Amino acid sequence: SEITLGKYLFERLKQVNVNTVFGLPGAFNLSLLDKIYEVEGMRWAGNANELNAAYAADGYARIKGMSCIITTFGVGELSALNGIAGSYAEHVGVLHVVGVPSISAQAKQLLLHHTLGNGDFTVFHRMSANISETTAMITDIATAPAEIDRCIRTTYVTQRPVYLGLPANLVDLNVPAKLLQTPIDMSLKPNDAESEKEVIDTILVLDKDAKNPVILADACCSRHDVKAETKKLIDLTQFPAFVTPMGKGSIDEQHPRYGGVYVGTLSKPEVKEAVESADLILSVGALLSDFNTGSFSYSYKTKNIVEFHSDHMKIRNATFPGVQMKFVLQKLLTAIADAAKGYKPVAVPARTPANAAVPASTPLKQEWMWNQLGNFLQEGDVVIAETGTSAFGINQTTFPNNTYGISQVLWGSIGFTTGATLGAAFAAEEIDPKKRVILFIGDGSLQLTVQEISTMIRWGLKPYLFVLNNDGYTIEKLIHGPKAQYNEIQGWDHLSLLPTFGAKDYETHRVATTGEWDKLTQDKSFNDNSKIRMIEVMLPVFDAPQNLVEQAKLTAATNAKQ
Amino acid sequence: SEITLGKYLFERLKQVNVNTVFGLPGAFNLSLLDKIYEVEGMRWAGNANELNAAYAADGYARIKGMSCIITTFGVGELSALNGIAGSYAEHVGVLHVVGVPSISAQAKQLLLHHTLGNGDFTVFHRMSANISETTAMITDIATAPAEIDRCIRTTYVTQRPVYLGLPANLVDLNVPAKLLQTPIDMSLKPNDAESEKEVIDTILVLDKDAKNPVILADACCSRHDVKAETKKLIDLTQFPAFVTPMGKGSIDEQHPRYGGVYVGTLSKPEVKEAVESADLILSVGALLSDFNTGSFSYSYKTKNIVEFHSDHMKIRNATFPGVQMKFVLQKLLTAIADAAKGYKPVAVPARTPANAAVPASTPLKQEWMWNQLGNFLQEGDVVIAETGTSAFGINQTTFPNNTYGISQVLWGSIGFTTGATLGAAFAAEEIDPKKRVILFIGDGSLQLTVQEISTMIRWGLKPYLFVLNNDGYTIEKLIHGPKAQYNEIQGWDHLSLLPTFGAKDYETHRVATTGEWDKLTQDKSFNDNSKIRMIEVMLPVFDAPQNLVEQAKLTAATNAKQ
Ligand SMILES: [C]C1=N[C]=C([C][N+]2=C([C@@]([C])(=O)C([O])=O)SC([C][C]OP([O])(=O)OP([O])([O])=O)=C2[C])C([N])=N1
Ligand SMILES: [C]C1=N[C]=C([C][N+]2=C([C@@]([C])(=O)C([O])=O)SC([C][C]OP([O])(=O)OP([O])([O])=O)=C2[C])C([N])=N1
Ligand SMILES: [Mg+2]
Ligand SMILES: [Mg+2]
Secondary structure, three states: EEHHHHHHHHHHHHHHOEEEEEEEHHEEEEEHHHHHOOOOEEOOOOOHHHHHHHHHHHHHHHHHEEEEEEEOOHHHHHHHHHHHHHHHHOOOOEEEEEEOOHHHHHHHOOOOOOOOOOOOOHHHHHHOOOOOOEEEEEOOOHHHHHHHHHHHHHHHHHOOEEEEEEEEHHHOOOOEEOOOOOOOOOOOOOHHHHHHHHHHHHHHHHHHHHOOOOEEOOHHHHHHOOOHHHHHHHHHOOEEEEEOOOOOOOOOOOOOOOOEEHHHOOOHHHHHHHHOOEEEEEEOOOOOOOOOOOOOOOOOOOEEEEEOOEEEEEEOEEEEEOHHHHHHHHHHHHHHHOOOOOOOOOOOOOOOOOOOOOOOOOOOOOHHHHHHHHOOOOOOEEEEEEEOHHHHHHHOOOOOOOOOOOOOOOOOOOOHHHHHHHHHHHHHHHHHOOOOOEEEEEEEHHHHHHHHHHHHHHHHOOOOOEEEOOOOHHHHHHHHOOOOOOOOOOOOHHHHHHHHHHOOOOEEEEEEEEHHHHHHHHHHHHHHOEEEEEEEOOOOOOOHHHHHHHHHHHHHHHHHHO | OOEEEHHHHHHHHHHHHHEEEOOOOOOOOOOHHHHHOOOOOEEEOOOOOOHHHHHHHHHHHHHHHOOEEEOOOOHHHHHHHHHHHHHHOOOOEEEEEEOOOOHHHHHHOOOOOOOOOOOOOHHHHHHHHHHHHOOEEEOOOOOOOHHHHHHHHHHHHHHOOOOEEEOHHHHEEEHHOOOOOHOOOOOOHHHOHHHHHHHHHHHHHHHHOOEEEEEEEOOOHHHHOOHHHHHHHHHHHHHHEEEOOOOOOOOOOOOOOEEEEEEEOOOHHHHHHHHHOOOEEEEEEEOOOOOOOOOOOOOHHHHHHOEEOOEEEEEEEEEEOOHHHHHHHHHHHOOOOOOOOOOOOOOOOOOOOOOOOOOOEEOOOHHHHHHHHHOOOOOOEEEOOOHHHHHHHHHHHHOOOOHHHHHHOOOOOOHHHHHHHHHHHHHHHHHHOOOOOEEEHHHHHHHHHHOHHHHHHHOOOOOOEEEEEEOOOOOHHHOOOOOOOOOOOOOOOOHHHHHHHHOOEEEEEEEEEHHHHHHHHOOOOOOOOOEEEEEEEEOOOOOOOHHHHHHHHHHHHHHHHO
């Protein structure tokens, strides 16, 4: 008949397919964490710090659908803020629960640990409200179940962080268990009928008139869950389909109508021209950040641009506030084939040619590696690429179908990917034990969050950790200060990290040549996700993908401009 | 003639005795960082992450007087916030300079990396305003020197963090170099003459009357720079002098008038009675947090209390807004000996007896270790104790005179001390190469900030890193859940950390018996700060100082109270 508020939270999380919970303990949340162990199928990650935990919750949400991190008042929550900000910026549904002092301790304004010593128990909640879609600070047991529900719903449907503060005393108070028998409503509200019809009719007419329409899938294609619809749209229409860096993975790169990675002026000439020559652009989930776009360098030649977004539509100069793309895309599928029936298929640019055979002793170079990497990938892989050369280079890698890419192009917080790898590996394990998780992280970025490797080991997760050793911050050196000491890093013994963190079942590998790369990555046992691996990749100091060389100059100029 | 705004900043920092600058680079601050190398006597730490950099700037400021951390917009600054908030809570003057997008970039609202994608460039500044004494976001070159000077002054005189945003384009513009020839005013404003005279005269008359006065030194004694005056006051009066956990180190423990560590009901009975039986209490810099006070358990039996504070005075029920203790204490030196001339000295409580001789093979215990540690310490040592058993246990250690203690009793962010150790070691090196820096950090806390050892190594800093291996979060286990899996940690090979981060000149030791403890710590070579050292200390899982056992129960009850 009755259940603790704490246990109710974990029962709800289990109902919405969140099965791993991130964060660190502190006195203000200990009684709440107890409740995790009362719920079958729920686990506590036991993160090495709160920032890493927040990055992990982000990785988990991207793969699983949403996530939860629990921290402690002041010291835990403030540690996590950069992770939460990144989740807000990139539209990732992370529920951040904070164990806060009891109602009675607040009432009496006790000078407790983890406060600013001024009796203000609102300050951290206030700070988090800036990077949250909504917040709740629970003060009474009576409406607490509904507020938990609302927070979980909002996290999921808006795909942005939500803040939920739970006083220590309230987690052990009882609420009706019967509440758990009605599901949380996880569904979008239908669109305005008249506005949605206008948009659909208008698109269909633009489609009928188009001779070279193109589809461009960007971040929100993935973040707001329209990949299936976009795939159908591609198949029914036969229109060329291109993807952005931030949306890479949202469309199948083995589809015969897939045209490549569009990055404005930084695209392959053939890709740039194929996109920009379009007489109708179907833009799915645009997020036009500097790195996503070669510093705002799109040069569409047509006015006929349809922008599909999670919360609104735009057609040419006309805006349709509130009209959600999910339902527009679904309903379009009914009549889009008819609208496209006169289309005569325009050729797409061909895939970048495979690397030519070279001697086994050929030193590894970035351009070669990114082009070679597609050989190692397989359908189902989660492929994570850190801000730095890795994020820029993965744009050149051809993905198998059904690859989930993670690249934090907008927020661009180095170190993110160590934590994201952990969360992705949890979620991937829960989905399918044979799903591989593959990380490319710079030597510089690894340093910020290196301890989260510990948490991978403790749970026997088996990601592939490729560390690009180029002796410092190459991306920065290419922006400004190529020999500046601030761009250099202390030299670590990367392959000793796993055993240092107590790993027992693992492999470590170093590759420095083309021969070594091929030998390792083509190897049958290596391709099985049987244990955690670290691969140290030795690369030259100033070597970078060409797109990064160019973007670095553009970014330098933007910042230096008077 | 003219100097860049960026170089002006570093010239000012040099003038105010800030010679190490903390933080991490990002495109928005790279041109600024260049200017560090243009100023002789200035260096860039090259921190391994921003949170650790903020903890470091905090440790540096505690030893040196104030500090500066530079981060990048969004990703850098938010990472630092837990460090900044602890500095705000514990009154440590840290100048947080953030490299922000150029004026033209903000005006056109470019969708740049490290933004929330909504074109709001004020949001992170807003967030930091909550944990800063003042803020400045520089927009006009003409007033930028004055604004820098204002921020530096405020950081130092108020001993609280200040936020300074510097658009990337502005750092390279010129300002008049002759401004540098007039020093920043770093002095307190004189007190209101009449109010101060009233306070002084009243205290001198209370003094003349008291038969059992005592002096109690707390956190703000050291944080607000009145340690010399307080010591001199003890010497002139010969009144018994006690210290709090947060103030420990502020007064000299090898002084015939030193009475012990007062912690309300957690005190030695002799110490508790000596303080609470007083007929006059001279309280210097009180900060009555839960852990500092045994959960608010002071039981003074007099109302004759003089509270000295940085920004005001209190005498019994009478408050004197704005009367700063610095000048009150200094001027009391003139006539307080005469006022105290009738005082017949009351005996002080005896110091805890030395440990009894025990067999060399006796396994190490916490209580023995804290009571032995005083043998190893020397005058001038910086002694840093992490939240957990270390912070509570260090209360039991006798300090040599002139010991700088660091224990973050109020904010209590585990991991703080790895960074604080770096900051303190930089400062100590600048003050006196022979000054030792000694850390006691738990195995759990080390995990959150472990990478900052890298930065110690790269600069050839030589602290003593004592890591307390008790297989998890013992403090938490004693509060709630002694066998809870959230209180356990992944087991690391601690002694491999130094070589894993590239150390070449170092020692590692393990101690597990009293014999091993004594042989190592009494060793003449060990006692020289000739290289970085890590000492793994093997301790039992549930072993703790008695004061923690008691505090842990009081904390649990406070959180659980309905
Ligand atoms: C958290 C954080 N911090 C800092 C930063 C910066 N960064 C980056 C950028 C781009 O972002 C800018 O600048 O803005 S990048 C970097 C470096 C990295 O390195 P690595 O990892 O090594 O890579 P490569 O390139 O070499 O491969 C930096 C520092 C951020 N972001 N975040
Ligand atoms: C950042 C951060 N996080 C978390 C936390 C919590 N904690 C602590 C306290 C007291 O604070 C509470 O509870 O709140 S403590 C801890 C643990 C530690 O462990 P170690 O280091 O290992 O030590 P010993 O010696 O005791 O064992 C925790 C987790 C904070 N704070 N912060
Ligand atoms: Mg690198
Ligand atoms: Mg421990």
